[PDB]
Coordinates of C-alpha atoms and ligand atoms in Angstrom, one line a residue:
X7 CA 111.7 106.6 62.6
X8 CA 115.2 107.0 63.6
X9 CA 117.1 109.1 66.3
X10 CA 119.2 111.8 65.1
X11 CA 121.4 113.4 67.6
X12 CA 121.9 116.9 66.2
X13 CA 125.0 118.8 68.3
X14 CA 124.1 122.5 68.4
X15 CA 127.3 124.4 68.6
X16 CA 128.2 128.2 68.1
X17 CA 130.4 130.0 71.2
X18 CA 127.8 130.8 73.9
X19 CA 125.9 134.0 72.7
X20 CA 125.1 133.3 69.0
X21 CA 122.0 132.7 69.7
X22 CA 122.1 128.5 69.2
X23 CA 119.6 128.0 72.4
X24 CA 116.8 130.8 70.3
X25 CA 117.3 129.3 67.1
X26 CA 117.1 125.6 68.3
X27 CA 113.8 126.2 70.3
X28 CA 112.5 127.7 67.4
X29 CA 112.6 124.2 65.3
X30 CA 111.1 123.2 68.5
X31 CA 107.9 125.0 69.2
X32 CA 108.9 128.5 66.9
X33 CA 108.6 130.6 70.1
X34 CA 111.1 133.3 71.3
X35 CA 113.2 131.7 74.8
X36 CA 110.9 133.2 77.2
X37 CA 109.8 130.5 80.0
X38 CA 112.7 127.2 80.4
X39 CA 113.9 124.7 82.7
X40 CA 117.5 125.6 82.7
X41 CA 119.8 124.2 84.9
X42 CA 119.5 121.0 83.0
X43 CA 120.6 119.6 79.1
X44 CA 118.2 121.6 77.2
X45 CA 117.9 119.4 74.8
X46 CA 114.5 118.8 72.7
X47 CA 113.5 116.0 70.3
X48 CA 110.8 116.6 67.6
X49 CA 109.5 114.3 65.0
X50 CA 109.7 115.4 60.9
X51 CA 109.7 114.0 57.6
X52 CA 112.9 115.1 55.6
X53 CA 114.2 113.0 52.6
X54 CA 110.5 111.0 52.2
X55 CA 111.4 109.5 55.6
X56 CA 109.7 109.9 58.8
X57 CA 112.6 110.1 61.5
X58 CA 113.1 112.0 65.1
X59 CA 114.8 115.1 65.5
X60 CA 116.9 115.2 68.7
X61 CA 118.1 118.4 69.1
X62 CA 120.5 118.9 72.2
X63 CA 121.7 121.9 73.5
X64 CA 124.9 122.1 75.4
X65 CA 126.5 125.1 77.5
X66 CA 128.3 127.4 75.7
X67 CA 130.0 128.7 78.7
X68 CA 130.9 127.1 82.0
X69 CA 133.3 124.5 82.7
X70 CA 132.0 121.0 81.2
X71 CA 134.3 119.3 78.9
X72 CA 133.6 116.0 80.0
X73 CA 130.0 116.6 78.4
X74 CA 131.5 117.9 75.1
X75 CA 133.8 114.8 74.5
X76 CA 130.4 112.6 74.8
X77 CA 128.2 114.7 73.1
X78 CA 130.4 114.3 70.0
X79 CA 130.3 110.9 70.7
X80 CA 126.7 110.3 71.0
X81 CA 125.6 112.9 67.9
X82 CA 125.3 112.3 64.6
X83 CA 126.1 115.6 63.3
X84 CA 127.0 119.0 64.5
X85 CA 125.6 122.1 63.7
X86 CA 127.8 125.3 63.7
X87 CA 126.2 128.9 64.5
X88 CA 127.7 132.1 65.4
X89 CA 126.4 135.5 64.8
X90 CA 127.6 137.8 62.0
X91 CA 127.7 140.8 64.5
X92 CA 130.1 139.0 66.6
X93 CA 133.2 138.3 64.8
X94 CA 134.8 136.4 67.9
X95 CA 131.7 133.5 67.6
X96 CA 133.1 133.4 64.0
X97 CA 136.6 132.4 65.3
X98 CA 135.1 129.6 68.0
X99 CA 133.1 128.2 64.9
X100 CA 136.6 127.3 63.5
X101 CA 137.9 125.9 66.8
X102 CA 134.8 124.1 67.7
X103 CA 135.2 121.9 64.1
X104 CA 138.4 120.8 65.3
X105 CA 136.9 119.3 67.9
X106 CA 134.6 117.1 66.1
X107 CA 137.0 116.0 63.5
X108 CA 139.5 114.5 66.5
X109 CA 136.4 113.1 67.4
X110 CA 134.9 111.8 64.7
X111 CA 138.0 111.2 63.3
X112 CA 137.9 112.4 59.8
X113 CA 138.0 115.6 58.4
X114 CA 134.6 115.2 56.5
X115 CA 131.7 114.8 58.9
X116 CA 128.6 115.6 58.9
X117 CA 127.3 118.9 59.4
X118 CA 126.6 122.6 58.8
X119 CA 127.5 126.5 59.3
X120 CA 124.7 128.5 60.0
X121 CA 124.9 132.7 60.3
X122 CA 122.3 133.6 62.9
X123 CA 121.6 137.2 63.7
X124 CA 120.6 138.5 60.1
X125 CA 117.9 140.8 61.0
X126 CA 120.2 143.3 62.9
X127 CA 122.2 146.4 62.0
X128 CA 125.3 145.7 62.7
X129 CA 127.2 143.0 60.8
X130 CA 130.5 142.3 61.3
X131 CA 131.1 139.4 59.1
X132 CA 129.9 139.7 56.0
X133 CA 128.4 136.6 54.7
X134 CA 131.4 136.5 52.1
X135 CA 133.6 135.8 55.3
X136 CA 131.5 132.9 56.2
X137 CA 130.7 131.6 53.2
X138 CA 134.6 131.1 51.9
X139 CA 135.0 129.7 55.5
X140 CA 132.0 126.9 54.9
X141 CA 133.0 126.6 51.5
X142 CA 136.2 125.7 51.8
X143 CA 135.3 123.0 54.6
X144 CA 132.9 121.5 52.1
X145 CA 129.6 122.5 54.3
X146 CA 126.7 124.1 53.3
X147 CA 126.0 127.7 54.7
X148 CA 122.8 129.2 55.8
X149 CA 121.5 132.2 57.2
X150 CA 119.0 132.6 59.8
X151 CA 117.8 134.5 62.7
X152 CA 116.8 133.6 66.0
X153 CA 114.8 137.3 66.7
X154 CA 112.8 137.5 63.4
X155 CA 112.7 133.7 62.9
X156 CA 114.3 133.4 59.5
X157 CA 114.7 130.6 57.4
X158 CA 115.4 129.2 61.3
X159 CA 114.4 125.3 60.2
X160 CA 116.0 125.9 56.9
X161 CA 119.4 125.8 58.9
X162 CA 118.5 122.9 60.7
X163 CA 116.9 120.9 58.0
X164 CA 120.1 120.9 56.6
X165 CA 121.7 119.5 58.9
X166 CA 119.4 116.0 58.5
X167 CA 120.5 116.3 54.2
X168 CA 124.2 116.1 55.8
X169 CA 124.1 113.0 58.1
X170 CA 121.5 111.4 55.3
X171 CA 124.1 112.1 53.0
X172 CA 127.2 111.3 54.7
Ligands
GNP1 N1 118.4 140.5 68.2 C1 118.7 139.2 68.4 N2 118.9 138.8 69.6 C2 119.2 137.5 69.8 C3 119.4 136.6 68.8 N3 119.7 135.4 69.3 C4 119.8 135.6 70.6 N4 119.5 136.8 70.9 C5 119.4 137.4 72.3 O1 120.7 138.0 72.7 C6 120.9 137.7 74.1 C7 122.0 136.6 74.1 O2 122.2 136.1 75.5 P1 123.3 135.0 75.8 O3 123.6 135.0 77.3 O4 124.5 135.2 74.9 O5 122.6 133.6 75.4 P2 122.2 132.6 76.6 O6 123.4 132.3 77.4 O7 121.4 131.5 76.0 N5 121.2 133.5 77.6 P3 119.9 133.9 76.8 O8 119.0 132.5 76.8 O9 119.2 135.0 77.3 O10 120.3 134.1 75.2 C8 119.6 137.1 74.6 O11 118.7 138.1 74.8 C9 119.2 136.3 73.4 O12 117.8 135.9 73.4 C10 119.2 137.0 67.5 O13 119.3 136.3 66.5 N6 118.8 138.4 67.3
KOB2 O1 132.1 112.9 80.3 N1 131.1 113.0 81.4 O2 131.4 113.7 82.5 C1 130.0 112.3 81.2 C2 129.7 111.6 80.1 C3 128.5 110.9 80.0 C4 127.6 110.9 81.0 N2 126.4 110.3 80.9 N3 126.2 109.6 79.9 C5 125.5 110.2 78.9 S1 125.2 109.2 77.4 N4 125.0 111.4 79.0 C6 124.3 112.0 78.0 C7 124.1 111.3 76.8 C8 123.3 111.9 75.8 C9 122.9 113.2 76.0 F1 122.1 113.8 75.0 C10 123.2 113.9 77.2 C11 123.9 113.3 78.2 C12 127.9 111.7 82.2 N5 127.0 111.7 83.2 O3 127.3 112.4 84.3 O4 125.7 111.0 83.0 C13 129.1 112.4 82.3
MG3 MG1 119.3 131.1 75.3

């Protein structure tokens, strides 16, 4: 079994928190401990390999910087989700990677570019926008959603083929 620090990111109101509970216990946020990293660790088998699945959860809002510069730091891999009816989280997905390459320090690290919020009615970015975003980062792009729970681990999951990978 081995530790992997999966760093959820998005903007603050993608929906990263729903969707990351979900891999948890696949329940809508109703009942939390907030105040506090709301992070959660879960053990899987991906790749033939039985390994735990630390997922933590920073604060998309709030002043906490500190935090981000060591989350990077701990974490293995980032995950990137914003919500297709919010163009703006599509622009902080874009920032956000910057972040983690200065960090890393490479261009190519590992992770992915999930589009939660597919069940509404109201899409701003088309997936096309998204997916010659992820595309041309050389990151695999997924599409979720944290309200009907779609294809919610198959973002995550990827995630663990990125890290394993690179
Ligand atoms: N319809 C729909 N709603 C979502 C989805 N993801 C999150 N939401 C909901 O939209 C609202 C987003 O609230 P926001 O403050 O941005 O997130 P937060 O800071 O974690 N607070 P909360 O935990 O309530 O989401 C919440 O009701 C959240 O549960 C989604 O994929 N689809
Ligand atoms: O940049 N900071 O302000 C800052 C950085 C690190 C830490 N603690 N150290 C660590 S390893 N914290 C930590 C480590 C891993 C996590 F998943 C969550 C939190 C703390 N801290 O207050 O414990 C603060
Ligand atoms: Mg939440």
């Amino acid at each position: 079994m081995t530790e992997y620090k999966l760093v959820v990111v998005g903007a603050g109101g993608v929906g990263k928190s729903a969707l990351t509970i979900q891999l948890i216990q696949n329940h809508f946020v109703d009942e939390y401990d907030p105040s506090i990293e709301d992070s959660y660790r879960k053990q899987v088998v991906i790749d033939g390999e039985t390994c735990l699945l630390d997922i933590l959860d920073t604060a998309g809002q709030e002043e906490y910087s500190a935090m981000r510069d060591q989350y990077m730091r701990t974490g293995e891999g980032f995950l990137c989700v914003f919500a297709i009816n919010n163009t703006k989280s599509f622009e902080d997905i874009h920032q956000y990677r910057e972040q983690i390459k200065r960090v890393k320090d490479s261009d190519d690290v590992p992770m992915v570019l999930v589009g939660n919020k597919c069940d509404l009615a109201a899409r701003t970015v088309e997936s096309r926008q998204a997916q010659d975003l992820a595309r041309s980062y050389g990151i695999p792009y997924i599409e979720t959603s944290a309200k009907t729970r779609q294809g919610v681990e198959d973002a995550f999951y990827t995630l663990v083929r990125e890290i394993r990978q690179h």
